[PDB]
Amino acid sequence: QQPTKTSNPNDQWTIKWSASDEFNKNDPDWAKWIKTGNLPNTSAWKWNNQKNVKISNGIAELTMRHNANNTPDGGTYFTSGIFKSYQKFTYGYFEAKIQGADIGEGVCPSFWLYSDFDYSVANGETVYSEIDVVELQQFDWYEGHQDDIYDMDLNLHAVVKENGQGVWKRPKMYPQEQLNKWRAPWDPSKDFHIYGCEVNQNEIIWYVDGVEVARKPNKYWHRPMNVTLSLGLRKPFVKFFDNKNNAINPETDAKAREKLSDIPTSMYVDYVRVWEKS
Ligand SMILES: [Mg+2]
Ligand SMILES: [Mg+2]
Numbered sequence: 001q002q003p004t005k006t007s008n009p010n011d012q013w014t015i016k017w018s019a020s021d022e023f024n025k026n027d028p029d030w031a032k033w034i035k036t037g038n039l040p041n042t043s044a045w046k047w048n049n050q051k052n053v054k055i056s057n058g059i060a061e062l063t064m065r066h067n068a069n070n071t072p073d074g075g076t077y078f079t080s081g082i083f084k085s086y087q088k089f090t091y092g093y094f095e096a097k098i099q100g101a102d103i104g105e106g107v108c109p110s111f112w113l114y115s116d117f118d119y120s121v122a123n124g125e126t127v128y129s130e131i132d133v134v135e136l137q138q139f140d141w142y143e144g145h146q147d148d149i150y151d152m153d154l155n156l157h158a159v160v161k162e163n164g165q166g167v168w169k170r171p172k173m174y175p176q177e178q179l180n181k182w183r184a185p186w187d188p189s190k191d192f193h194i195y196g197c198e199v200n201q202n203e204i205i206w207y208v209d210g211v212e213v214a215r216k217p218n219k220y221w222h223r224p225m226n227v228t229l230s231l232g233l234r235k236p237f238v239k240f241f242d243n244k245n246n247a248i249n250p251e252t253d254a255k256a257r258e259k260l261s262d263i264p265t266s267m268y269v270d271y272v273r274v275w276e277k278s
Helices: 254-262
Strands: 013-015 053-056 059-066 078-080 082-089 092-099 107-114 126-136 151-153 156-162 165-169 181-183 192-199 203-208 211-217 225-233 238-241 244-247 265-277
Touching: 059 082, 059 225, 078 225, 082 265, 092 107, 092 126, 092 225, 107 192, 107 265, 126 192, 126 203, 126 225, 225 265
Parallel strands: none
Antiparallel strands: 013 265, 053 059, 059 078, 059 265, 082 225, 092 192, 092 265, 107 126, 107 225, 126 151, 126 156, 151 181, 156 165, 192 203, 203 211, 238 244
16 A cells, blocks of 8 residues: 555555554554553543454454543543554654544544653754644634534644753644644544654645645654544543643533533544655
């Protein structure tokens, strides 16, 4: 198999099985994907891959579940599921075929690449690199525009060392360099579509169903990153302050309580494929 669409047909692409999976096996491949431990810091929910990852008939299912009895675990009320490659990559092509979640608003099916934090690097250097190949169903609010289910985000995030500190460079702070939004003509929660990203030393280009939808210069995104599919929690179950999702107790908020009838909810992934340019 090859990348659906690339910027230069003269390039050659070699599939990298260390972060590619057609999910034809019902036993998740925990040699390839990190089951526990080394998973993203989430302040608003926890991961439970034993309970929240299932694969059936060629399709992986990642599920957001409400904790039994509404009992917090370390300040959080839900668990989710995540495929995080052990293998890191920097440049290459990354693609996943994904269908979103039936809840509509409240979770964020995501395909994304992220590094560790290296706070040792020199002034101006990158501490942390994150490329979001797609964030679905976030219902983001930006400059007075409220998104709905058809809108998606395709953003870059980094932390850069400045005057001794790691300073976050966020998409809404640097939108020309880092923010991408695209509106689909179909509801991403209802069917599978193909989300791709081509990453090289110069540029990062994003594709949806084989159409280029965004491109940005590669300013900071040169660190090794793990290939990630995960189902994130969003409002009404979280509330933003201090540059982080804070968990909301779904029994203390009407909007969160009424969405509980729609939990558990799942994203689905037919494949993930990674290539390197040869
Ligand atoms: Mg299967
Ligand atoms: Mg499959």
